[PDB]
């Protein structure tokens, strides 16, 4: 029945953690790696390409945890990682609830209907009450919460958790203690006065809580919520068990001509990011990757050998070097590549769709220190935008170069690269813009009118796409009203 390819692909669980800085991602990542027996990798993560992709075995699943750069390293590449996973894990600091970056990263997951599980971290310190945390998750992540584990107390009074389906009490300071219904005197023996509160909460959950439903989880409509304390490696086992059991394996991926299924024998993969020193990171969409093989780079029309590929793999497995759907590989190259590029082993022309550019929130105008360098600046900005390092907008009404960054670090990298690779010394000037949307209107007449009236706010980006630049989302909301026929989108397909 199942081929070797389909058996391997079915074992993969490829995901990333979405969280706001200081929620606990690094700490939880270290503990996950320890369950995976990935001792060295955990030591590496705790000490801070090697860590962009961490693969580890757990309960015979091959888990691929892709890093989502955060803090000062937050960039459009963080959102690009989310286009390569089949599911995500949300980590929240229980004292803060859903925070700004949690929401923006969930907005990306939502466009892709990516399933998400949720870990509420730091229950060992005073926290939002669990009913309030659940309401906050639903309100800001726009998803139903299905509690899987439920905390008893918080902070100094945090006794541990009760696992609703496994009927197990997990004590905080280790095997769960099996509990036999709400009346089990084991609850009073282990929880003391807090047993009454667990009983009240369980009664409330029975009446008003949402059960886990795998189909709703897989559609992105419901998230299983776990509570714990990653620093104590507590509650993490239950969440990981649930993740390997229920999180989706490699999913079909749309291409312009058809949907590609992971069980197709012929290799296909898509580039979702590029690291400059260059390495292109490819998600394997179907088929089997082997070092030996030849791949067709359909954009350039060239054949590419991959004898120098990086196969990210666990310290653990030993056999012949191959990689399967859901896995990530890195292909070194001398600058040939765009985000979204498709590689195939067959001659079938395939073009994966659905890796977009994302609307930037930070904008700067570029100024040259030396006017004689104008052609080099145009070359460098165009090549850096084609490569995905920044977005570039050219306003209809002037000749300015306006750069759009998802993360501010990007502006520093562009200046560095302009200097080093183009011999161009550029500085930034501030602009009013904080918002871009790509505009579209299937009515040719109304659109010409829009483009005439709002000519001062329109720009064309490096892909040729028309965009409305606004000082902020509220000023934007006002142009939308004047033209209820024009669509304003927060993403656009790369070509
Ligand atoms: N008290 C407590 N502190 C935690 C827990 N998890 C992480 N921290 C602390 O919170 C801070 C942020 O943790 P980190 O894992 O680096 O967060 P990141 O920015 O999301 O990767 C550090 O001081 C951690 O020790 C937890 O479960 N309980």
Nearest-angstrom CA–CA distance, 269 and 248: 18
CA of 136 to the centre of ligand 1 (A): 20
Give the DSSP letter string of 376-433: HHHHHHHHHHHTTSSEEEEETTS---EEEESSTHHHHHHHHHHHHHH---EEEEE-S-
Nearest-angstrom CA–CA distance, 108 and 79: 7
Deposited experimental method: X-ray
Q: Cβ(19) to ligand 1 under 6 A?
A: yes
In the block, tokens 């073009």 appear at: 351
Nearest-angstrom CA–CA distance, 494 and 310: 25
Phi–psi pair at 39, nearest 5 degrees = -60, -50
Annotated binding site for GTP: 19-26, 67-71, 121-124
Identify the bridge partners of residue 429 per DSSP, sorted by sequence position.
365
Identify the bridge partners of residue 269 per DSSP, sorted by sequence position.
284, 343
Distance (Å) of CA 354 to CA 14, 253, 412, 466:
18, 9, 28, 19
Residue 89 near residue 352, CB atoms below 8 Å: no
Residue 468 tokens, joined:
């409305």
Closest CA to 257 of 348, 184, 340: 348
- What atom of ligand 1 comes closest to residue 230's alpha carbon? 27
What is 355-495's CATH topology? Alpha-Beta Plaits (3.30.70)
Ligand 1: residue of 18, 20, 23, 24 to mutate (most ligand atoms within 8 A of CB) is: 24
Q: Looking at the chain, how many residues does it have?
A: 495
The reply to whether CATH 3.40.50.300 applies to domain 20-46+89-246 is yes
Give the SS3 label for residue 355: coil
Residue extent(s) of CATH 3.40.50.300 domains in the chain: 1-19+47-88+247-354, 20-46+89-246
Q: Which helix (H) or strand (E) holds 271?
A: strand 268-275
373 CB contacts (<8 Å, ≥6 apart)? Answer: 422, 423, 424, 425
Nearest-angstrom CA–CA distance, 368 and 365: 10
Nearest-angstrom CA–CA distance, 403 and 431: 10
Ligand 1: residue of 26, 27, 67 to mutate (most ligand atoms within 8 A of CB) is: 27
Query: Which residue's alpha carbon is at the smallest distance from atom 27 of ligand 1?
Result: 229
How big is the CA angle at 80 (ends 79 and 82), to the nearest 5 degrees?
70
Residue 320 tokens, joined:
């012949």
Nearest-angstrom CA–CA distance, 132 and 316: 41
Residue 405 near residue 360, CB atoms below 8 Å: yes
Residue 176 tokens, joined:
């769960």
This structure's resolution (Å) is 1.8
Q: Cβ(68) to ligand 1 under 6 A?
A: no
Nearest-angstrom CA–CA distance, 5 and 262: 9
Q: What number does CATH give the domain 1-19+47-88+247-354?
A: 3.40.50.300
Closest CA to 67 of 106, 19, 109: 19
Residue extent(s) of CATH 3.30.70.3280 domains in the chain: 355-495
155 CB contacts (<8 Å, ≥6 apart)? Answer: 124, 125, 126, 127
203-210: which pairs have CB atoms within 8 A and are 24 or more residues apart?
204/131, 205/147, 205/150, 205/164, 209/146, 209/147, 210/144, 210/145, 210/146
Q: Cβ(228) to ligand 1 under 6 A?
A: no
Query: Which residue's alpha carbon is at the smallest distance from atom 5 of ligand 1?
Result: 231
| 12-19 vs 61-66, strand pairing mode | parallel
């Amino acid at each position: 029945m199942s081929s070797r390819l389909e058996r391997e692909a079915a074992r993969r669980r490829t995901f990333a953690i979405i969280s706001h800085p200081d929620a606990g991602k690094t700490t939880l990542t270290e503990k996950l790696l320890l369950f995976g027996g990935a001792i060295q990798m955990a030591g590496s993560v705790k000490a801070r390409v090697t860590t962009s992709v961490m693969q580890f075995p757990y309960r015979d699943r091959v888990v691929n945890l892709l890093d989502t750069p955060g803090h000062q390293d937050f960039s459009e590449d963080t959102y690009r990682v989310l286009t390569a996973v089949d599911s995500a894990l949300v980590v929240i600091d229980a004292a803060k609830g859903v925070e700004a970056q949690t929401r923006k990263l969930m907005d990306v997951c939502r466009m892709r209907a990516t399933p998400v599980m949720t870990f509420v971290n730091k229950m060992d310190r005073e926290a939002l009450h669990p009913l309030d945390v659940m309401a906050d998750i639903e309100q800001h992540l726009q998803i139903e919460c299905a509690p899987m584990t439920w905390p008893i107390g918080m902070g100094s009074s945090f006794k541990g958790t009760y696992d609703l389906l496994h009927k197990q009490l997990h004590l905080f300071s280790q095997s769960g203690i099996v509990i036999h219904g709400a009346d089990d005197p084991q609850l009073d023996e282990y929880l003391g006065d807090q047993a009454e509160q667990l009983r009240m909460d369980l009664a409330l959950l029975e009446e008003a809580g949402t059960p886990f439903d795998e189909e709703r989880y897989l559609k992105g409509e419901l998230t299983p919520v776990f509570f714990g304390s990653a620093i104590n490696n507590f509650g993490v086992r239950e969440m990981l068990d649930m993740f390997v059991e229920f999180a989706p394996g490699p999913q079909p991926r749309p291409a312009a001509t058809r949907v590609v299924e992971p069980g197709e024998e012929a290799f296909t993969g898509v580039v979702f990011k590029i690291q400059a020193n260059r390495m292109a990171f490819l998600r394997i969409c179907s088929g089997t990757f082997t070092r030996g093989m030849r791949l067709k780079h359909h954009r350039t029309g060239k054949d590419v050998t991959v004898a120098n590929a990086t196969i990210f793999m666990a310290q653990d497995r030993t056999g012949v070097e191959e990689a399967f759907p859901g896995d990530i590989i890195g292909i070194p190259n001398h600058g040939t590549i765009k985000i979204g590029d498709t590689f195939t082993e067959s001659k079938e022309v395939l073009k994966f769709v659905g890796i977009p550019n994302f609307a930037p929130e930070h904008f700067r105008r570029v100024r040259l220190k030396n006017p004689l360098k104008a052609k080099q600046l145009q070359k460098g900005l165009e090549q850096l935008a084609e490569e995905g390092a920044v977005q570039l907008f050219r306003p209809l009404v002037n000749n300015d170069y306006i750069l759009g960054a998802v993360g501010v670090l990007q502006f520093d990298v562009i200046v560095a690269r302009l200097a080093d690779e183009y011999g161009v010394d550029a500085v930034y000037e501030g602009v009013s813009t904080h918002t871009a949307r790509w505009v579209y209107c299937e009515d040719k007449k109304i659109f010409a009118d829009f483009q005439d009236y709002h000519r001062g706010e329109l720009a064309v980006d490096a892909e040729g796409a028309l965009a409305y630049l606004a000082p902020n989302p509220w000023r934007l909301e006002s142009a939308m009203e004047r033209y209820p026929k024009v669509e304003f989108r927060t993403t656009r397909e790369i070509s």
